[PDB]
Each structure stands twice: as C-alpha cells, then as structure tokens.
Write an enzyme that holds these catalytic residues in place. Sequence first.
Site, PDB file in Angstrom:
ATOM      1  CG  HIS A   1      -1.735   1.156   1.381  1.00 46.42           C
ATOM      2  ND1 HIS A   1      -1.252   2.399   1.766  1.00 46.42           N
ATOM      3  CD2 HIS A   1      -3.036   1.269   1.059  1.00 46.42           C
ATOM      4  CE1 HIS A   1      -2.294   3.222   1.676  1.00 46.42           C
ATOM      5  NE2 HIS A   1      -3.391   2.572   1.269  1.00 46.42           N
TER       6      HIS A   1
ATOM      7  CG  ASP B   1      -0.760   6.255   2.781  1.00 47.43           C
ATOM      8  OD1 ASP B   1      -0.237   7.207   2.138  1.00 47.43           O
ATOM      9  OD2 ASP B   1      -1.982   6.226   3.098  1.00 47.43           O
ATOM     10  CE  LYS B   2       1.308   0.764   7.969  1.00 49.01           C
ATOM     11  NZ  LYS B   2       2.563   1.405   8.486  1.00 49.01           N
TER      12      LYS B   2
ATOM     13  CD  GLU C   1       7.767  13.126   7.962  1.00 51.94           C
ATOM     14  OE1 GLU C   1       7.321  11.958   7.861  1.00 51.94           O
ATOM     15  OE2 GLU C   1       7.607  13.831   8.985  1.00 51.94           O
TER      16      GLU C   1
ATOM     17  CD  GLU D   1      13.263  18.201   9.154  1.00 51.79           C
ATOM     18  OE1 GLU D   1      12.728  17.453  10.008  1.00 51.79           O
ATOM     19  OE2 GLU D   1      12.645  18.631   8.154  1.00 51.79           O
TER      20      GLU D   1
ATOM     21  CE  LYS E   1      -7.252   1.110   2.168  1.00 53.62           C
ATOM     22  NZ  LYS E   1      -7.796   2.483   1.904  1.00 53.62           N
TER      23      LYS E   1
ATOM     24  CG  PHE F   1      -6.812  -2.951  -6.843  1.00 53.00           C
ATOM     25  CD1 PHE F   1      -5.815  -2.006  -7.141  1.00 53.00           C
ATOM     26  CD2 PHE F   1      -7.027  -3.284  -5.515  1.00 53.00           C
ATOM     27  CE1 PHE F   1      -5.027  -1.452  -6.106  1.00 53.00           C
ATOM     28  CE2 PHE F   1      -6.231  -2.760  -4.496  1.00 53.00           C
ATOM     29  CZ  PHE F   1      -5.255  -1.837  -4.795  1.00 53.00           C
TER      30      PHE F   1
ATOM     31  CG  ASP G   1      -3.826   6.607  -2.913  1.00 49.73           C
ATOM     32  OD1 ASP G   1      -4.244   7.758  -3.058  1.00 49.73           O
ATOM     33  OD2 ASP G   1      -3.815   6.022  -1.805  1.00 49.73           O
ATOM     34  CB  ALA G   2       0.163  10.440  -3.701  1.00 49.60           C
TER      35      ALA G   2
ATOM     36  NE  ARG H   1      -2.895  10.926   4.707  1.00 49.02           N
ATOM     37  CZ  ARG H   1      -3.116  11.553   3.562  1.00 49.02           C
ATOM     38  NH1 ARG H   1      -2.346  12.565   3.194  1.00 49.02           N
ATOM     39  NH2 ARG H   1      -4.139  11.206   2.795  1.00 49.02           N
ATOM     40  CE  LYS H   2      -3.898   3.508   4.773  1.00 46.71           C
ATOM     41  NZ  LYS H   2      -4.058   4.967   4.508  1.00 46.71           N
TER      42      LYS H   2
ATOM     43  CE  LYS I   1       7.373  11.514  13.559  1.00 50.04           C
ATOM     44  NZ  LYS I   1       6.222  11.919  14.357  1.00 50.04           N
TER      45      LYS I   1
ATOM     46  CE  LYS J   1      13.201  13.599  15.582  1.00 48.74           C
ATOM     47  NZ  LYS J   1      14.650  13.762  15.718  1.00 48.74           N
TER      48      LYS J   1
ATOM     49  CG  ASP K   1       4.766  12.462  17.533  1.00 47.64           C
ATOM     50  OD1 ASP K   1       3.908  12.826  18.392  1.00 47.64           O
ATOM     51  OD2 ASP K   1       5.014  13.105  16.500  1.00 47.64           O
TER      52      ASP K   1
END
Lengths: 380, 380
Positions: free
Chosen positions: A14, A16-17, A42, A55, A166, A235, A243-244, A249-250, A270, A274, A276
């Site tokens: 996918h 994003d993955k 990123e 960075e 998915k 598909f 899809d970008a 995003r997941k 990260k 970080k 997060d």
Amino acid sequence: GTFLFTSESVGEGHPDKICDQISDAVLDAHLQQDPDAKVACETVAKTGMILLAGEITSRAAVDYQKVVREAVKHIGYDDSSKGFDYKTCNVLVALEQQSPDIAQGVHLDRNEEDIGAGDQGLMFGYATDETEECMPLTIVLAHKLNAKLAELRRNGTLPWLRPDSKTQVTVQYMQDRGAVLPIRVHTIVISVQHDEEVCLDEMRDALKEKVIKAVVPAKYLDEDTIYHLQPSGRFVIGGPQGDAGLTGRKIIVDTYGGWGAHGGGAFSGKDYTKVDRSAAYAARWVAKSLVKGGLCRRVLVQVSYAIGVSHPLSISIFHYGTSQKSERELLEIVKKNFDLRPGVIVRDLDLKKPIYQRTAAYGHFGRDSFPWEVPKKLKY
Amino acid sequence: GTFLFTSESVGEGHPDKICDQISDAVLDAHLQQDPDAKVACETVAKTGMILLAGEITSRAAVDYQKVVREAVKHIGYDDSSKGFDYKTCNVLVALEQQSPDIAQGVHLDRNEEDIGAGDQGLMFGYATDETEECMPLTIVLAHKLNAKLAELRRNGTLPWLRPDSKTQVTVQYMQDRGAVLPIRVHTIVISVQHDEEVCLDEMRDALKEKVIKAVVPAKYLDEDTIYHLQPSGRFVIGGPQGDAGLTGRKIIVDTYGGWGAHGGGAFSGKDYTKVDRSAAYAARWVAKSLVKGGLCRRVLVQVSYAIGVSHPLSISIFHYGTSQKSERELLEIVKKNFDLRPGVIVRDLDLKKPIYQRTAAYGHFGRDSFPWEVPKKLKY
Ligand SMILES: C[S@@+](CC[C@H](N)C(=O)[O-])C[C@H]1O[C@@H](n2cnc3c(N)ncnc32)[C@H](O)[C@@H]1O
Ligand SMILES: C[S@@+](CC[C@H](N)C(=O)[O-])C[C@H]1O[C@@H](n2cnc3c(N)ncnc32)[C@H](O)[C@@H]1O
Ligand SMILES: COc1nc(-c2ccccc2)c2cc(Cl)ccc2n1
Ligand SMILES: COc1nc(-c2ccccc2)c2cc(Cl)ccc2n1
C-alpha cells in the site's frame, strides 16, 4: 447489548505503508552506524518516485539510493508490469540537518536520562484482554488477512497477486462490564492489486477459500457474514501509480484500529527523542502491563509532553470500569512503576536498536515480543 | 473522580497545516469551475519547496503556481527572513488523472445518489455537551490560542511573531455519569516561531499576558497552573525549513484532540466521494444532532464503507452512559433520520461548494456553522 465495530489494515505495498517502511529503513541504516542519530525522515511515493524529505543529523554514511531501492525490492515492486520497479524508479533526496534551534532545546549538552522531549504532543496506549496479544480482534484479523495475501504472493500460490492491498473487518461484539467480547465476523472487505490476466470470479473464490478461510476461525463465520471481495471490480493499477503515499498516513492501522484513542503523531522515520514514537510505545507497554498484571481487562493510557521538557506534563488512565481499583489508584501504580522520560524509555525499550523497519507493516503492537510487548511485573 | 486530559493545536504556518491548506486551496480551485471534480491532492513542504502529488480528474483549468503561492501568501510566509517566501519558493507538480480502475468502480455510469464510496474505511463522529459548540474544551482552547497568535501577528501587536506555532492544553475534569465537566486548566504549552531580535523574557511575558489571558477564562487559571512558554528557548528557524510538512499529518488536531476516536483518514485535498472526509463530516453531524436534540450528553458514532459500495457496511453508537435510551434505540433513530450514502451526504452537506480551505486550520468541527455543525431535527 451487541454492537458492531470495524477496523482496517493495509499490505506492505500500500503506498502509504511503502513510505513508512522506507522511512524506517532509513532510520535503521543510520542507527546501524550511529546509535545517537537524530532522524526525522518523511517519504512520499507517487508513480516512479520516492522522495525523502526531512531532517537528519548523524555520523553515519548512508547510501540513500541503495537503502530505498532495497526496501522497495523487499516489498515486491520489481517490474514495470506491477506499476513500480525498485531498479528503475526515481529516488530524490531533500534532507537537511536537524534545526540547530531544536537541537539546542532538546538534547545538546543534556544528560541522556534528562534529554527533553523532541516535541510537544499527546500519546495513548491501549490494551484489551479479548485476545492473548491484548489487541482488538478486528485489527488482528485485518492485519492477518494482509499478511496471508503477502504469503500467497511470495510462495507463488496466487501469482496474480500484487503487493498493494487493503482489508477491513467488522465484528459483532457483546458488552461485558466494560470489557468487550467478540461474537462473530459481520463483514469482511478485501481489495488487492492484481495482474491483467486473472478474472474476477477466480480472485473472489481464492480470496474466500485461500485467504479468509485460512485466517478467520470458522466459528466466527456464518451464513449471514457479508463478503466484499474485490468490490471495485478491477484493481490492476496500484501501488504509488494508483494513489500517492506519504509517511504517517496509516496511524490507526499502526495502532489500535479505531479502538482506544490516538494523539496524532506518526511513528516511522523518527528516532527515540521523538516522543510521538517512544512515548506511544511506552504507553502501550504500560497498558499491556496493567492488563497482563490482572489489574484491569481493558485500559487506555494518555501521556503528554512539552518540547525540551523531560518529564510528561500529564498521565491519565481510563479502565472502562474493568478494574476493582479506581483510576486514581491505577495512576499511582503506574507512577510508582514507570519512568516515562524519553531518556529512560530509550533504555527500558532498547530504542537505539535498528529494528524499526520490522514495525512498519502489520501494526506496531501485538506482534513479535518487541520490548513494549513484554509486560513489566508491577510492584504495589 | 478527577482526571487530566490534554489536546493540542497548531497554527496556520505549521508545515503540516500549510500542506492541508494548500491541498484544500487546490480542491476549491477545481470546484469553482467543475463541481464534480475528482480530487486527491497531497502536498509536501520542505525548505523552499511545495510539491503537489496525487490524482485529479477535472474539467477545470487551474493555475497551480498561482493557487499555491496565494495560499502561502495568506498564511504569511512572504520573505526569506521568515524562512519561506511565496514569491520565490519552488512549486513542483506531480499530478496525474484519477486511476481509471478506481473511476469505473466508484462513479462511472452511476446515478449520483448511488455512487460508491471512493475507498473503504472507518470514520467517527463525536460530540460533547461540555461547550455550546459541542466540542472538548481542551481542543477549543488550544485552537483559540493559535488563532490569537495569528491575530496579534496580523494586527502588528506582536510583530516578532512568525506563522508557525503549536499549543497544548491540559484540563482537569470531573466525571459526571459518563459526561465530563471541566474544572481548571492544569498546563498550557505555547511554542511559536519568532524573529532574531526579541528576547525570551519579552516573548514569555507576552504569551502569558496578551495570548493566554486574552483566550482562557480566569476562572480556569490559578496559582498551580503550569506554563511552558517557548519551552525550547529558541524558535527562529520554523515553517517548512524547520520540519517537513505533509497533508493529513494533523488528523487529531483536525477533529477531537484525542477525545472520541479516529478512523485514520485525512480530510484535506479530497472531494466528497472520498468518504474519509464526507462520512466523517456526516458522522459529526449525527453526533451533534444527538447531543443538541437532548438524546445524550456525549456520543461517539462509527461508520464504515467498502470501495464501490454506496451504503455503509456498519453504523455504531456509543453514548458513554449519557442517555436514558439504549445504544440500540439511538442507532434506530439514526437509521430513521440519516442516509449516509456519499451521494446523499453531498446533497445534505452541500459538499460540492468550494469552502474547504476555510476548514483546513483551527479544526473542521465546532466552528462557523458549516452544514455538518447545524443539527438535524430528529423524528422518533
Ligand atoms: C482508492 S485509493 C484512494 C483514492 C484515490 N487517491 C483517488 O484518486 O480516487 C486508496 C487506496 O485504495 C487502494 N486502491 C487503489 N486502486 C484501487 C482499486 N482500483 N480498487 C480498490 N482499491 C484500490 C490502494 O491501496 C490505494 O492506496
Ligand atoms: C519540533 S519539530 C519536529 C521534529 C523535527 N522534525 C526534528 O528534526 O527534530 C515539530 C514542530 O515543532 C515546531 N518547532 C520547530 N522548531 C521548533 C523549535 N525550535 N522550538 C519549538 N517548536 C519548534 C514546528 O511547529 C514543527 O513543525
Ligand atoms: C463497550 O465498549 C465500547 N467502546 C467503544 C469505543 C471505541 C473506541 C473508542 C472509544 C470507545 C465503542 C464504540 C462504538 Cl462506536 C460502539 C460501541 C463501543 N463500545
Ligand atoms: C470520563 O470519560 C473519559 N473518557 C476518556 C476517553 C478519552 C478518549 C477516548 C476514549 C475515552 C478518558 C481517557 C482518559 Cl486517558 C482518562 C479519563 C477518561 N475519561
């Protein structure tokens, strides 16, 4: 007293993955040479392109072209017929050093245990006794359906499969004094990228017989279960061409599938400073320790930080009514047993180790006995 | 019976939020010419660069360079001294048509009311009676602190302010039969980008006196309230130069600040057929209708979809024990009053209207009487 709940998962291909796995491949490459690398990588993926933006301050010498392409090869995008090829895609790099303003405020000239949080933010941990791994059944089943697709693709059982997929699982639950009890699978969705030659009926039959039946216990499936298999009907175009993709995003697929709560921070790309990532892993560790310790059946933990400050600003516990102890008492047990400063979490969870690419597909929790999945024995 | 809860917000110049606003400026530009535009525009921002990546099928003739630069100008990045300038930054475009495989499975040759969901996924709506706008106090206060910073920057009161900011509010609450009652503000964090000339003490005094006191009622602030103002000590480098931004990386800031739940889908840069946005807006509409209708004090709504299928796969309601009606009864009221097909939501919420850039900072909910914020009168 019954209700429905739905969670989704996505495959390794996918878009994003793909980005999350590349971001964590970059992080791991830096940590292999410099355990103290400061990384905020990123990734963006679109037709023919991987772009790295972010960075990094590190002593490592990393070959970004090789690291990126090796991650894409692992995923399975190795030919233009599949819509993406690691050998021939564009890899663009827009990486700079970490802002010196951030560095001076977070970690420069600081004792490691007393390093500041790398940003402000809020994070949650969650655990539920509905599965042995203390995760919601909806998300566990959704992840296992994508893992099965990847297994059948890689072993050549279903050679028409492509890496982008998915899944989505709806379970009917019963409420049980704040805990939740799975009854049956109400609906399953599977969408997976495929070759130009296979027909829809062959795919739908294989998805039911070789994928769903190989993953979901028959006790959860009945005559009323609804199946949406290849619901779009076609598909062929998939991966970044369809899809970008972007890193982070997941974040719900990465965590609890809609259960619990989320503070918004992404994990991949990260380093431990970080919060997060590190504080979300520590919060999962706390939640799982409370459930496995027999203090509650289901629990949500929130923690929060300010940039440059080591200790959390707040810690909160919600037990859904599944403990005989009050939430105030559980909070006191947590405060006596855990030190949630990032410079202490790094030691407890061994967060300088380059195992991050392993976390970047199929969820960060409930798998493989990572340090945050090994409960701490509590003293109270 | 008290607990702490924390939420954050970010300013218009936070790099992730810049991306959300540019993505929605692109969407609005297309909708102004073609109300049926199919848009999936992701934005990435890093030092000197805005990159648009994604898929658009539209009859509109859009000047991406002008639309992007005008959005950055609005935000306030107009000089290299601020770290970013709309006049001179690079704008790169990697936009293709929507995948024909998606188009044929979702909307081609479909009656508008019967268009399929543009993807699978899960979405939540949430409402709480703790504020008139039915939003958590933590998130409302965090958003208002960023809006105050932007106001004082734009009116020249604090000319050292720059557009990139983050805020975080921790409130101490009391539990009240499932509802939550705010007691006091426990901690506030503010970090904002600033010029090279202003000193830390001047900034900290202004943030307390001109920002916090201008936003947070004095009844919530006391001698024990903790303030972390410019906690990093220096924030001259900011915007995309300090941290890469991406669209859909502030999804919790966009929604409920950690309260309720999130299904993972981002809002910005997507037309109504992408249920990540339209069904989340409809779920907010349902939740707010239930609370304003006096059926509960606090409520969570989940909905889910399969790509190509118009009707939701599941709908669930959780009222936290704040209704005399059972969750099953509330679900029946919802099913009798709402039609959550995307081709019906578009009509009820007027989702072809180009108002999306207005949603892309300060949260999508609890503001400006957007259609999803006007409760529906319920029949039962
Ligand atoms: C449907 S696409 C998202 C919408 C898309 N950006 C558009 O332009 O309409 C989101 C995800 O669904 C999957 N997908 C892509 N093409 C698909 C297809 N033809 N049928 C089903 N799922 C598809 C891929 O995993 C993709 O990343
Ligand atoms: C701290 S940065 C994220 C970490 C960063 N990518 C790194 O390389 O360490 C995240 C957000 O915090 C804010 N920020 C940037 N520089 C900052 C500074 N010097 N002090 C405080 N906040 C800062 C900006 O809003 C930025 O988007
Ligand atoms: C019994 O517990 C429970 N929890 C939740 C819940 C899920 C995520 C976050 C917070 C609460 C829930 C949600 C819905 Cl929509 C319906 C029934 C539910 N029942
Ligand atoms: C009284 O309601 C309530 N709800 C929550 C909650 C927040 C988000 C999602 C689900 C539940 C909660 C969370 C914490 Cl950490 C502590 C106390 C809490 N009390």
